[model samples]
Every structure is written in C-alpha cells, then in structure tokens.
Target: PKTLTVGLFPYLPSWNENGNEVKLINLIKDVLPTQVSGYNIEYTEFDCYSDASLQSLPDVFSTDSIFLPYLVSLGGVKSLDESLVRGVTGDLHSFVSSSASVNGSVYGFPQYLCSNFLLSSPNATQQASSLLELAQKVGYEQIVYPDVASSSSFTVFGLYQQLLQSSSSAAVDIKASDLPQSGDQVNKDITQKYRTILDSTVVASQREYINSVKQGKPISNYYVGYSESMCEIKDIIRDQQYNVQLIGTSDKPYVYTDVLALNSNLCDEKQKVAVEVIKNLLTNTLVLDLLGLGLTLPANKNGIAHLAKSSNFYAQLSQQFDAKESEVRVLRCVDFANKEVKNCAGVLRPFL
Candidate 1:
C-alpha cells in the first residue's frame, strides 16, 4: 500500500508543559484509519519553530492560523480544496474558518479555538480593565505573565490584547503598524504600564507555572494565559486547596485558531488521502475527544454543543466564540515578524 505521513505539531509541548504528548499521539492514531483511498497512514512529529524545513515536513501537519501565511509564502503548505474541507469548515465557527483562510482559499481545517484571559484568585473582588489596572490591584508582585522571550506566541497574544484595549478600531481592522513601537510615546506608556505586571515575580515559563499550580505552590494570585490553559489550571486548582477564577477583565481578548494543514509537496493522489484523513480526524466525536484532552473550546459547532451540556465552562467559552464575530484578532505571520512586535517584545523581555 502507498504511505501517507502525518506531522504532529508539538501543541502540547509548546502550550501545556504538563500535557502528555504520547497521549495526543495515541489519540490521533486511534482516530485515523489505517488506510485512506488505499494509502497507508503514518505519523511523525515536527516542531514548527525549529524543524519547519519544507523538505522534511510530512504530507499533512498541524499548525496555528497565524503561521499559515508564512507556510504558504515558503511553499510549505497547500491551499486546501474548499469542497474537500467543506464538511469540516462548514462546522467550524465562522471566525475560525476565516482565520484559516487567506485572500480567498481555505488553507486548513481548524481544530480548536483559544484566547488570552486573566486567571485571578477568588479573593480578588475588583475587576481590572487592563493589565495596568490588574497590576495596580494585585500589585506587580502578585501577578504573573508568560515570559516574553521564551514564549513569544503567548506573549504576542497578550500584547495584541493590550493593543486592542487601547485602540478604537475593531480587532480585524488592526494592523502591524498599529502596534506600539519601542521609541514612541504610546510605546513608552504601554511598556511602562506592563513593566509592573511582567516583573521578576512572574512565572518564568508555562512549565514552571503548571508545576507550581499542581504542587499547590502557585507563584502569584493572578495569571495571564489562553482560556484553554486556564481550563487546565482550573481543574488543578479544583483538585487542590489552591483557588483561582477566570475573571472578566478586558473586553477584547486575542483569539487564536489551531489548524490541520496539508503539505505543499503532496501530489493529487496523496492530497485525496490527506483530505479524507483530515475530515475523519475532525469528526464530531474526535473533535470533542480532542477538546477533552486539550481543555480547549471546539471549533466545530456540534462539538461545542455536546460539550456545553455538561459544563458551564464550555458555555462561557461559547460566549467568547460568539463575541469573535466582532472582537476577534489573530496574530498573523506578518504580525509575528513585524519590527513593531520585536520592539514591543524587547520592552517586555527585560521585565520578564
């Protein structure tokens, strides 16, 4: 039989230190068929950041929507057939489907939805409207944020949220040029405000924060991260004596969509099998199971509905998804490479 290799992006490794990569691997293996259109399916892992060489990528791979344009620019991923991906795309939240699309064509199938939010201790009564307000209420010492230098993606989401809070424009309309640069007054004020929050007291890494929370030795009363991670943290807090709550703060949060994209190198024959495999992997049962594994909101409408029945948490997440029609902002490939992003990153690097 012909072979089709699937690449697993290190989502667990990059996002959740406590997550079991092996489990995700096994889950995918179990969900996929042994063969698709007579092609035997095989799997491998690749780090998009370190091992994203075009020659080495598998026939299909997982990636963030933010990286889609870059992958397309590098000829690393293919523009998916709208008809082939329609079954999956049709089920996704409108915003998610759009995020995975460029100019006109859909490039990938969105797997899950994520966004940055504040996780605060139950003792915190006051709601903070911004990082500066949160810093003032909890003090710099009592709050923790992702380290900017090490976790640039997470940090970028936080920075995007900050920019959205200060801007009058809608999230989709914001551009790289809108980002605050290092030397400007806007940059100075924003940097100065965040300096208090991204201090020495902050959690140095996601791994450190996960381990600390699990051990009931949380470093701070306030944490900033994606809602997917906040779900994991919530479970950890529930099982232990530690207490943390997902607090409503800023009206604008940076939303993200994770996707499964095809390799640009695939032939017509291989593309058929790859597309079939992607559709199967995105089935309602499988998507719901993946959501349970990652503690993330599902991109599929049915998956969301099924999960929402048991937990109010999914309901809250659904509201965020609903808000996405007007409030969604994603970090695109260009935004990731923007000098403004680098300059802003530089400002936070010292404090983190």
Candidate 2:
C-alpha cells in the first residue's frame, strides 16, 4: 500500500478527543487504506512555532500543520489545481475564496476563520454592532487592553487598521508590501485610541486580561481580543450574574483563515490518490465536527448550516457575521518571524 502523510497543528480541536490526543489513524482506519483502495494515510502533528512544522510537508498540509505561518507566506508550498475545489466556490464567501488565492493562483483551501472582537464586562450596558460604533460612542474611555509591549496587544493594531479603513477622516492608502517599514507612521495614527490604557493601571498583559475580566474590575466597559478565548467571559458571568457579550464591528475587521493545502512534492505515483485522500480528509465528518463545537467558523456554507442546528453562541456568532455586509480581511503572513514585533515596536516606541 502507498502512504500519504498529512501535517497539522497539534492543538487543533479535532486532534483531541476529550482533551487528549486522538489516534487519528485509528479513527479513519476502517475507510483509509480501503478508501484509497491501496494507500494508507499517516498524520504528523507539530507546534505552529516549532521546527517540526516545516519538516513534514510531503503530500498534504493542515493548519498550523508542519509549517509556520511565515514559511507559507514566503512561498514554501506548491499550488494545487483549482479544479479540485471548483464546487467549494459558491459555498465559500468572496473573502475566503480570494484570500486562499496567492497572487492569482489558489495555493490553499480555507478550513475555518477566526478574529478579534469587542467583549464587555458583566456590568456594561452598551450594544455595539461594530468597533467603530463602540469607538464613536465611548470616545475611547473605560476601555482597557493589554500593553503594546505585551504580545496580546494585537487588537491595538487590528483596531487601528479598522479605524483607518472605516473612518473617512482617518482613511489613507497603504500597500501591504510597505506596512513593515511604515509601521511607525501606522502606529502614530493607531496608538492614539489606546493612549489612556497604556499608562493607566487599567492596562493588562495577555494573562492578566483574562484574570482582570474574571474579577470584573479594570476592564469594566470593554475588552477586545480573540473570539476563541471568551470562555472566561462565559464562565465568570455564570457565578457573577452579570451580562457579558462578545461584539463584532464592521468595515474590515482583522481575521485569521486557517487553510489546507496540497504538498508540493507528491510523487507522480501518489498524486491522484493523494488528492482524493486529501479531499476526503478535508470534508471528513470528524473534521467538520469542529464547527459544531463553535471552535471556529468554517469556510463554507455547509459548515455554517451544520452549526445552525445548535442554536446557541456558535449560531448567534455566525448570525452576527451574517448580518454584516463587509468582507473581513484575513491577517497577512510575513517572511520574517520578527516582522510583527518590529511593526509593534515602531508603532509603540514613539508613544512611549
């Protein structure tokens, strides 16, 4: 039997069964060699930041699979034929489909999407459909965020870009290619929103942000961060009996789209089998289960519909995005790992 190896980030929701790593091979063993007729599928997991992530790109690639984000951005993977995903077109949104295309060719298939959003403390009464609305109402008071020096201060950059794109007064043209060097100017305009929190006791680091929210103190009005990490908001409110909600704003919010790709080095003998197996795994039932858990928003309509039946936070979050007319922009990958740090530094240094 021929062998096809797949790579993925070890922490992916489907990678664990009840908080423990699952034997992915055993889960699909029945149909595997039988499904391919003569080939076996093997999986290798890696940390997104570790070296192992780049060492296993043989036939298929998964999110955070074997390669770091920058490696993929730097042109490490080979392009796959679009014909393989022709049917996924309509199911995928314009943003999802276009972001998957590197330049003009399709290099990856999006598995799911994630982003930062505005979250409120238990006592806040505001209802903001987008960050711009929230900004317009609050004028940047009672808002706390992790320090720009803290890695978690990412929302600072995201909201800066959002305000620039959404406000006519603030909007200006800047190419993605020039972002790294122009970070100082970018930070100048962007850092103003967080000026109050930067020097105040209300500020937090990533770990501290969660705890502060739990204590219901510093971040009394709003906190902005990753969508997946809101479990604390839910957990703390259960006992505190306060109203807490996660909010999204329109006009180009920052997003992350996890994607799957074909291995550039598939042997001629394994090409057909590899493509078929990769497709099977992409649409596999277990993999699709992630959407149901609300861990992510899938890239296609089918995944969205699957979550619709649950009728809770996942469904409502899906609905919230559904109500927005603007397409969310996915974060770009940089060739150098320190590129983000440099951008952050240039943006915050002048403010200091």
Candidate 3:
C-alpha cells in the first residue's frame, strides 16, 4: 500500500481546530486506522504557519473551515461528494452540512457550528430590520465593533456578505452548489464592498466595549454580536436595565462552523480513504473525546443531543438551528485565498 500524505495543524492562528489540542495528535493515531479501507495513510504535522505571508498552508488541512474555499480555489483541496459515501448525512445537523458547502458542493465535512447573532432590543420594531437599515436608525457613529485584530471583526463582515446581498445579486450569492465554479467576480465584489464598509467603523477594546455598554449612555453597543451568551446580553440590559435582548435577523444572521476537509491534490482512491477516516473520527469513539473536552458541540446529532440535555446553553444553540421554527438568517463565511483574505485582513490592521 502506497502511503498517502495527510496534513494536520500542530497550531493555527485562531479558533483552534482539530480534536482538542492536547488530544488531537493521539486521537488521530489511536482512534483511526493506520490503513483505512484500502489505502495506508502517513501523517504530516503542519501548522497555519507552514505557509508564510498568508498565501498558503501545508499540503492538507485539519484547519479552520474558512480555509476550505481558498484551498479549493488553489487546487490545494478536493471537493467532497456526499453521494460517494452512502448515508453520510445520518447524524449530522442540516446547517452543519450546509455551512461546509461552497456554492452547491460539499467541500468539507463539518465538525461543529457556533451561533452568531445581533444584540438589540427585545422591543425592536420592524423599522430595525436589515443591518444597514438598523444602522441607519442607530446612526453610523452610534455603531461600533471589536478591533480588527479581534476574531469577531472578521466574523462581523462575514455576516454582512450573507445579509446584504440577495441570491439575485451576483456579487452576494456565489451559488456554486447550484452552479459549480461560479461567482469569483461576485466574491471579489463582495470582499471589496466588505472592505469599504469595515474601513469606516469605530473599533473598541473588549474592556472598552464592556465598560461603554455598561455606562448605557453612548448608545452603548447594539445591533449585532458574533456570539453573546444569554446571560451576557441580559446582564447588559437588566443590570443596567438597558432594555436590550439578543436578537437575530430574518434575512441573514451569522453562524460559524469548522469543517474537516480533504486535500484537492489527493487522487480519487485517496479521497475515498480520507472520507472513511473522517467518518471513522465522527464515530462514537472519537466523537466522545471531542465532547469530553467541552469547547464545542460535535457535528453529529446524537453527540450534540447527549450534551444538550445537560447544558441548557447548548440546548438553546441547537434550538436556534431548527429550520421549521426559527426565522433567523444563518450566514456562512465567504472562502477566499490567503492572499486575498490577508489583503482584507491587512486593511483592518492599521486600526489595530
């Protein structure tokens, strides 16, 4: 059996991926087979720093799902076809699968999903609907956000991409799953638009953000947050009696998910093995390891269900994902190359 090279993160810049950092290395060795299906796999330990200057990473990624779009664009990773693996959707959440998708194709398998929503008044009327319209109501000067260097900053822009542009807007929806290899110009336009708006906003230190909002005079912080706990939002409103509630928009609210993906460089046979290996990791043995660590919810429904029963907050997050009842718009990040993403990141740095 020829050894197929696989890549994993020893470390990444942000929102750490892989099974828990302390355990991921051993988890790969102990939980997965040395030989999956027919092919033998050889592991290579790599980090987000493997590629300097934000242009690339090592051969494959066990990194953030954000990188999936760029890696696909660079021919660094392959598209994951779900049909090849029967019943792959068995225990996964619907939004979990959807978030990993680029356009229409399943490019990556999700590991977990995080809720991102707007923080506003429970008494909000229809007038404060769209983010743009809400901002207009609140005044751009009144609007504020975390610093550029903060993870929340990137997340805030991502929500804008999904919310502002409709499917009919070429620049907004790069409907690739519906039409593969479509929407580069659209993404460029989207990114440029994001670049422009973000450039103008006032950023805050987390300390400043907390302090200013508590004072309650400055219009404080309102409208949106990547993920504010119910208590945190309530504390802001109730402690100060600020009259705010954690709100989500119907058009597009932000949700972040991390995906485990295969490298595009892998041949057909190897890709199949990759699928088998990822599938195996999602099995009871490894999924439990992730749950035990307590940082995120597992992508598997059974695993999430088990955890939710004990943790009310997690149960609340799961409820947010329910399609039948929830009107919130769940936004996914736009995938772009490191160079392009870095350029956007650069635009935010000076203010940092």
Candidate 4:
C-alpha cells in the first residue's frame, strides 16, 4: 500500500475529517490518483504552516523550486529533476519558473498567482498621486505597514522598484549585487519615509495586515492584503464596517506564486504512488477554488484559467493584469533566500 501525504499553509484550509482540509482529501480520491488494482490509497493531512520554519513544520509541506537550491542543506527530500515527473508549464507558471529557477530545473512551482496592490490610508491618500506625490503625502501624515521583522524581502524590493517607477528619483535598477551595500539603505529609506508620513505608526502583527481597508487602526496607503485574505474577512469587514478602499496600483502590480513540492528522496512504490497522488492534487478544482479566493494564483496554466472563471473573486482579481503590468524577478537579491516569494512578500506603507 502507498500513502500520499501533502502539506499546506494553515491559513489555507486543510482536509479535516468533516470539511476544512478533508474536502481536499475527497477531491484527491474522487478526481485523482485513480485506484490501481488492489493497492490501497492512503491520504493523510499534515498540519498547516505559515512559512517553512521549524515552529511551523508540517509533516508533508510543499514549496517553490526556489528553495530547491538549498533543499540539500535541509536533508531528506531528493529532487525529481530526473525522470520521475516532468515540469509544469503555462504562460503564468512559466513566467515565474524561469525567474526563480537556476540551471535547467525549476526550484519552485507556484500553485496560484496574484499581484500585490498599492494601498493608502485615509490620511495617506489625501495628498497622494504618483509615488513621489505619495511620498509628499507621506511626508505629511502618519502610517503603518503589515509586518516589520517577518522575512518580506521580496515585497520590500518589489514595491521599492514601483516607488522608483513612480518617483524617477533613482534608477531602482540596482541588481542583486547592489543589494548587499544597499539593503540597509533601502530598509532605512523606506522606514524613514514611513516615519515622515506620520512619525507614529503601527509595526503590524501578521494576522490582519492584509485587511488594510477595514483598518482596525486608522492609517493610509496599505495593500489591504490580497483578495483571498480580504475574502476571508469580507463579511467580518462588512459587519464591523470600514472606510478604507484599495487605491490605484502602480501601472504594474507585483505578483506572487506558491509552489507545491514533494520529498524527492522517498523510495519504494509508496513514494512513487505518493508522488502521483500529490501531483494530482494540482488539478483539484475544489482545492483551487478555496485557494483562489485567498488571492492565490495557480501553478497549472489551466488551473489559473479555471480559477479566473470559477472562483468568486476570480474575475476581478485573476484578470488584474489588465489593470497593470508585472515584471518578473523584479526583486533581485544578494543575501536573500527564496527571492520568489520574498521579493513580493509585503506592501510598504508609512507610519505616522
């Protein structure tokens, strides 16, 4: 008998016995990993984790290929860059893959794709226009951003480039090499800019940082998280009431995609079957539907299209590219890990 195990972010719904995570469990059995002869199929749900940290380690977590570069350092899992399975492809997935992967193999695969939108607080938006205009507005008010210490390098750089695109202050064209010397300056400039906005700002904890719209605290110019995170609390926001609105993003918004990975080191039919089972999970519409609302872009080309058509926030968010353009690998790095996600990790706003 072979058991297929997988992992996911806890914020992401999981397969529980009743519904949460198990629904994905059902999708796997009913739609994929079709039964083979008498071999029993075992599907197990691992605990959810936010990031791949020891505190959040799930039994079978999936990840992007970007991490592939260093998986060997972690031990256990072997990469399937060999014949076991072919790679995933599509306009969107292909776009992210090339950027994050090195050599011929992709380090990560994005299960879903969504871009970060620029946001402003009531205070921040009053004087905002283009980024410099926003900077001028920021110079006048107080603001707060999602998180400070969380490893959101990708997000900082992506928005920083947008700020460049908007300000024309400097090239913002600095490469991965420029980062070592510029990292502190970049973070400092952004932080100082936030201080200039309001001087007193919220450092922001992880949970509600996305819902900048409802804004428990008053502030301006935040991304309000993704449509998925917003959808998660849409009703709550409506019931609680809010004044903030998502502002016009830069001509191009920064997009993020998460990939599903397996322990390539597993041997035996159990491992082989498990790999097949996990691969099938990619096509599960139920899983995708649940994730799409969370503003996740799909790794499968077909998956992205399906979500765009099938999910509630799908049309509005999935087709967001029309509203703006995106330049992949926009956030190159020197000392960063997982540039794929880190680059577009968080939205930068000011603190008053």
Best model number under TM-score:
1
Please, what are the lDDT tens digits per residue for candidate 3 over residues 1-352? 4665655543311212346334445544555566767677666655532235225433335655555554456555567667642254355555456556666787766655454444444344334444445544555344444532253434533543453444421113232231113233234544454444344345655445655554654434453443322232334454443332223333444455556666666777666677676666555545544443333455657656766666544455566556422233333334443344444444433322
Backbone clashes for every candidate come to 0, 6, 7, 49
lDDT of 4 by residue, 72-104 (tens): 345434444533334333344334554334445
- Runs off by more than 4 Å, candidate 3: 9-60, 63-67, 89-94, 117-153, 156-163, 168-251, 265-269, 323-335, 345-352
Screening candidate 3 with a backbone cut-off below 3 angstroms (N, C-alpha, C), the clashing residue pairs are 77-264, 78-264, 103-176, 103-177, 104-176, 104-177, 253-329
Would you give me the overall lDDT of model 4? Answer: 0.43
Per-residue lDDT over 98-177 for candidate 2, one digit per residue giving the tens place of the 0 to 100 score:
55666567777666656665655556666666655665666534454443335333444444445445422211223445
User: Lowest lDDT 10-mer window, candidate 1?
Assistant: 241-250
Residue-level lDDT of model 1, residues 1-352, one tens digit each, is: 5898887655541233446334455565566677778888886765555422433667888776655665666667778777667765466666677777776778888766665566665555555755556667665456666654254744744563454444333224334555545544244555554455554235467666777777777666667666556545656644443432333224454566778888777888988788788777666476466666556666667667777676555665666566555555555654343344456556545433
TM-scores of the candidates are 0.75, 0.68, 0.56, 0.56
Model 3's alpha-carbon lDDT is 0.48
On lDDT, the leading prediction is 1
Candidate 1 whole-model C-alpha lDDT, 0 to 1:
0.60
